[PDB]
Amino acid sequence: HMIGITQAEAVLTIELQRPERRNALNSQLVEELTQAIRKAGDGSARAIVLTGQGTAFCAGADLSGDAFAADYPDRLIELHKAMDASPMPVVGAINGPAIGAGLQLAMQCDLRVVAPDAFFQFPTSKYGLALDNWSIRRLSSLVGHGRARAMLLSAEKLTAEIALHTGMANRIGTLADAQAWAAEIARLAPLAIQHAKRVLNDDGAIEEAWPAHKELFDKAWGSQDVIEAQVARMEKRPPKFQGA
Amino acid sequence: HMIGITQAEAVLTIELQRPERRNALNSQLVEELTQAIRKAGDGSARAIVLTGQGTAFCAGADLSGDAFAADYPDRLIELHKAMDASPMPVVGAINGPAIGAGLQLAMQCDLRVVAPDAFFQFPTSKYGLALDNWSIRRLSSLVGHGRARAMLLSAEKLTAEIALHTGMANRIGTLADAQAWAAEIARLAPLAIQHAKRVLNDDGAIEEAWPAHKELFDKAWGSQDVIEAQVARMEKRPPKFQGA
Amino acid sequence: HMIGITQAEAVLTIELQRPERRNALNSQLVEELTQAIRKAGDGSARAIVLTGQGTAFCAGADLSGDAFAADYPDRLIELHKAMDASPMPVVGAINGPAIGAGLQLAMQCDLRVVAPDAFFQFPTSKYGLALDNWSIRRLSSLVGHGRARAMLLSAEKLTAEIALHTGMANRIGTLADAQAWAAEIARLAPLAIQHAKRVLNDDGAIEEAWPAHKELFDKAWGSQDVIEAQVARMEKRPPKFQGA
Numbered sequence: 001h002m003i004g005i006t007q008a009e010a011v012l013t014i015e016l017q018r019p020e021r022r023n024a025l026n027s028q029l030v031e032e033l034t035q036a037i038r039k040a041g042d043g044s045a046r047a048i049v050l051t052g053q054g055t056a057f058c059a060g061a062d063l064s065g066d067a068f069a070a071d072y073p074d075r076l077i078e079l080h081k082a083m084d085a086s087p088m089p090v091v092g093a094i095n096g097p098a099i100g101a102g103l104q105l106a107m108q109c110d111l112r113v114v115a116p117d118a119f120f121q122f123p124t125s126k127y128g129l130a131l132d133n134w135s136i137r138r139l140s141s142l143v144g145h146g147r148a149r150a151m152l153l154s155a156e157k158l159t160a161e162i163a164l165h166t167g168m169a170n171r172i173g174t175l176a177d178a179q180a181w182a183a184e185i186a187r188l189a190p191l192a193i194q195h196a197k198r199v200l201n202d203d204g205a206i207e208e209a210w211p212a213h214k215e216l217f218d219k220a221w222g223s224q225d226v227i228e229a230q231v232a233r234m235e236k237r238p239p240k241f242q243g244a
Numbered sequence: 245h246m247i248g249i250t251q252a253e254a255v256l257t258i259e260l261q262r263p264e265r266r267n268a269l270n271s272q273l274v275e276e277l278t279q280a281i282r283k284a285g286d287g288s289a290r291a292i293v294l295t296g297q298g299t300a301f302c303a304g305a306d307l308s309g310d311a312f313a314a315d316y317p318d319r320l321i322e323l324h325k326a327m328d329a330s331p332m333p334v335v336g337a338i339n340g341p342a343i344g345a346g347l348q349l350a351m352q353c354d355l356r357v358v359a360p361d362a363f364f365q366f367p368t369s370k371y372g373l374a375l376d377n378w379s380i381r382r383l384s385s386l387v388g389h390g391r392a393r394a395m396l397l398s399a400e401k402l403t404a405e406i407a408l409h410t411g412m413a414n415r416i417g418t419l420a421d422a423q424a425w426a427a428e429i430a431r432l433a434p435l436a437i438q439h440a441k442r443v444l445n446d447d448g449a450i451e452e453a454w455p456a457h458k459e460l461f462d463k464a465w466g467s468q469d470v471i472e473a474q475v476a477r478m479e480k481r482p483p484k485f486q487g488a
Numbered sequence: 489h490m491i492g493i494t495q496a497e498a499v500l501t502i503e504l505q506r507p508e509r510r511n512a513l514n515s516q517l518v519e520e521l522t523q524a525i526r527k528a529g530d531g532s533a534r535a536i537v538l539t540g541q542g543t544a545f546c547a548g549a550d551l552s553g554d555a556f557a558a559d560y561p562d563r564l565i566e567l568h569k570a571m572d573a574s575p576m577p578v579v580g581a582i583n584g585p586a587i588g589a590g591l592q593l594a595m596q597c598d599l600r601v602v603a604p605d606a607f608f609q610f611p612t613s614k615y616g617l618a619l620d621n622w623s624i625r626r627l628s629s630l631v632g633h634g635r636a637r638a639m640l641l642s643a644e645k646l647t648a649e650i651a652l653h654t655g656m657a658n659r660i661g662t663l664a665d666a667q668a669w670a671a672e673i674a675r676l677a678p679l680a681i682q683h684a685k686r687v688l689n690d691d692g693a694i695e696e697a698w699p700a701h702k703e704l705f706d707k708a709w710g711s712q713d714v715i716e717a718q719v720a721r722m723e724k725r726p727p728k729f730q731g732a
């Protein structure tokens with residue numbers, strides 16, 4: 001009910017379909033993507049393309065209304081496991097902005113074809129929040145350590161031009177471009193692709209948070225600044241953080 | 245009988261001399277390269293330039309009509325060991341294409357001066373094969389993870405301009421260019437260079453394969469798809485891989 | 489006495505004020521720096537800008553006239569610990585060349601805004617010296633492994649232009665630019681920044697040197713070539729290294 005699924009030749013295209021919220025994730029959306037990724041190759045498909053409907057790829061996470069929001073973080077982890085564990089290459093057609101949870105998602109794709117007006121952002125420094133280590137490690141691997149510092153420490157937007165520069169984007173193109181490419185890849189030797197993907201993903205980025213990292217994480221998440229940042233956002237005013 | 249070794253100033257130039265197979269590696273050539281790396285600086289030389297004769301640096305591996313062809317994987321590991329252990333900086337003059345084993349050898353150099361019309365490639369995904377972890381890790385560090393994903397998951401070529409971009413190439417230039425640069429390096433303090441090499445090479449790229457990596461590596465190498473890739477090539481036709 | 493410290497808005501600007509020596513790091517300047525960083529946030533400041541007076545950011549370590557040389561490394565280390573431990577983002581306003589220790593100090597900043605005439609260099613291979621692992625890892629993460637090899641193995645200069653390209657420079661700008669950016673960062677949630685800073689700094693660059701690394705490190709440092717570099721410099725001539 002919240003995603004689209006079409007197959008052409010050997011390419012499964014999975015389309016996020018919640019444009020009314022710029023494809024922000026929730027319990028139901030996340031759980032359907034998961035079933036969809038798991039059930040691909042069932043199936044003569046040999047490559048997956050992932051994309052958003054409308055103007056965004058995925059603008060983050062919106063749990064308003066969501067009855068199982070408590071379950072969301074767990075379902076989200078399952079979704080990333082499901083992708084990571086997939087023997088099928090996932091080609092992200094990043095049709096528009098990919099922010100926060102959406103950025104994580106885009107980064108969990110195996111390759112990325114980015115629309116010219118797309119951008120990537122972790123606005124965590126604006127919301128007093130904190131990321132898991134993987135998000136940071138993978139981000140670093142894709143934009144270089146230096147830019148990752150700017151992105152995490154100052155909510156810097158990574159434009160499409162620069163994503164291509166750093167390697168975040170493999171290509172600047174459209175959904176069609178990404179489907180063409182996915183079809184080439186569908187004709188390649190699956191086991192070779194299975195191997196490379198497993199090793200690539202095992203580059204270290206999947207890291208358990210050090211003891212001090214969990215501290216700072218929890219401290220950030222339980223802070224009053226977290227509440228201040230939301231009220232500010234809602235009021236369309238600058239936030240006045242207290243560092244607590 | 246299969247390579248050329250000349251020395252000028254304090255620069256040893258080792259040339260692969262099998263242009264009739266585009267300098268494709270085999271038992272003998274690997275053995276002779278190993279010897280030449282070790283016997284280097286015996287000898288007053290403080291720097292090595294490694295290059296290929298003809299249009300290509302090294303197009304892959306051959307073995308066709310190769311008497312001691314079974315201990316070739318072994319002799320190739322010896323070569324990489326020798327190069328990694330040489331107290332001498334090795335400047336690769338990548339005069340042309342560097343593919344598969346050729347790309348490995350190119351990466352095992354300490355510096356790279358790339359000709360405009362050279363490209364690098366791991367076509368393992370087109371042939372149903374799997375690489376060793378180091379090939380993957382070093383590649384990632386030289387082209388960036390993002391671009392490494394494209395080269396490995398879809399057999400994408402790395403052109404010279406892009407090599408310069410990411411740092412795979414330090415310079416775009418000729419053999420002569422590389423040799424002149426090597427002469428400068430020959431006048432720097434050996435012990436400084438020797439320390440830096442060891443540490444740089446010890447960045448973790450030299451990684452034992454995880455269980456899952458050995459398993460997938462082995463499935464691929466013993467797969468039917470490997471035969472299918474070759475017979476399809478021999479029949480000048482699209483391969484139809486089973487994933488097995 | 490040796491650094492200037494001002495605060496505007498919520499930004500602490502610390503200026504290295506030894507331009508007569510191109511801001512090279514002497515035992516005392518190091519301590520004053522260390523103290524200034526620790527004592528920051530004491531303090532309504534939420535961000536630090538670290539810059540140099542005159543034409544150079546920092547031309548390296550001093551030691552000339554130092555009656556207590558042996559203690560110098562421990563002070564330089566202390567300074568890095570202080571920066572690494574600071575909950576405050578340090579934006580380096582790299583107003584000119586950052587060489588050796590200068591480059592280390594620039595790399596321990598959290599973000600770098602670089603002047604168009606500036607450049608970064610480890611001329612260690614010109615002096616028979618060797619670096620600690622962190623300098624090597626962090627450098628590789630900032631300019632890419634390929635360019636890290638060139639810089640370390642041949643003393644290659646990283647221009648502002650290419651620092652921007654690789655991520656070593658987040659921006660090309662003036663001190664004032666760096667200060668405007670810092671002011672912004674100062675209005676972001678500190679706890680978010682503190683977390684990302686810790687995790688980022690814990691990417692592995694902070695590495696205990698391996699047995700072989702110490703061995704080579706000591707070997708270079710204790711070498712005769714180290715003296716020869718100093719002598720040739722003074723005698724205004726090309727060094728003549730021996731590898732011992």
Ligand SMILES: CCc1ccc([C@H]2C[C@@H](C(F)(F)F)n3ncc(C(=O)NCc4ccc5c(c4)OCO5)c3N2)cc1
Nearest residue numbers: 076077080081084104131132133134206209213214217
């Ligand atoms: C196995 C493949 C894989 C699995 C999960 C991830 C990421 C995904 C990503 C998200 F779901 F948000 F997108 N994500 N988010 C949270 C986690 C995650 O790993 N959470 C567990 C956790 C517990 C305590 C912590 C902590 C993390 O950080 C500091 O203290 C986590 N892990 C990334 C890759």
Ligand SMILES: CCc1ccc([C@H]2C[C@@H](C(F)(F)F)n3ncc(C(=O)NCc4ccc5c(c4)OCO5)c3N2)cc1
Nearest residue numbers: 320321324325328348375376377378450453457458461
């Ligand atoms: C110590 C310096 C050094 C030594 C060797 C290498 C690479 C070279 C590169 C090549 F020889 F092909 F060029 N290469 N190829 C194979 C190996 C290699 O290390 N092979 C052993 C091995 C056994 C089982 C495996 C496995 C690897 O991968 C998954 O399952 C290997 N090691 C790279 C660096």
Ligand SMILES: CCc1ccc([C@H]2C[C@@H](C(F)(F)F)n3ncc(C(=O)NCc4ccc5c(c4)OCO5)c3N2)cc1
Nearest residue numbers: 564565568569572592619620621622694697701702705
């Ligand atoms: C915890 C944050 C942090 C602390 C220190 C460093 C760097 C700084 C950098 C400098 F101070 F020069 F700028 N630096 N210099 C020396 C050290 C340093 O760590 N020295 C200890 C050491 C002992 C024996 C060794 C060895 C290192 O390398 C090979 O053999 C060292 N550590 C880098 C990051």
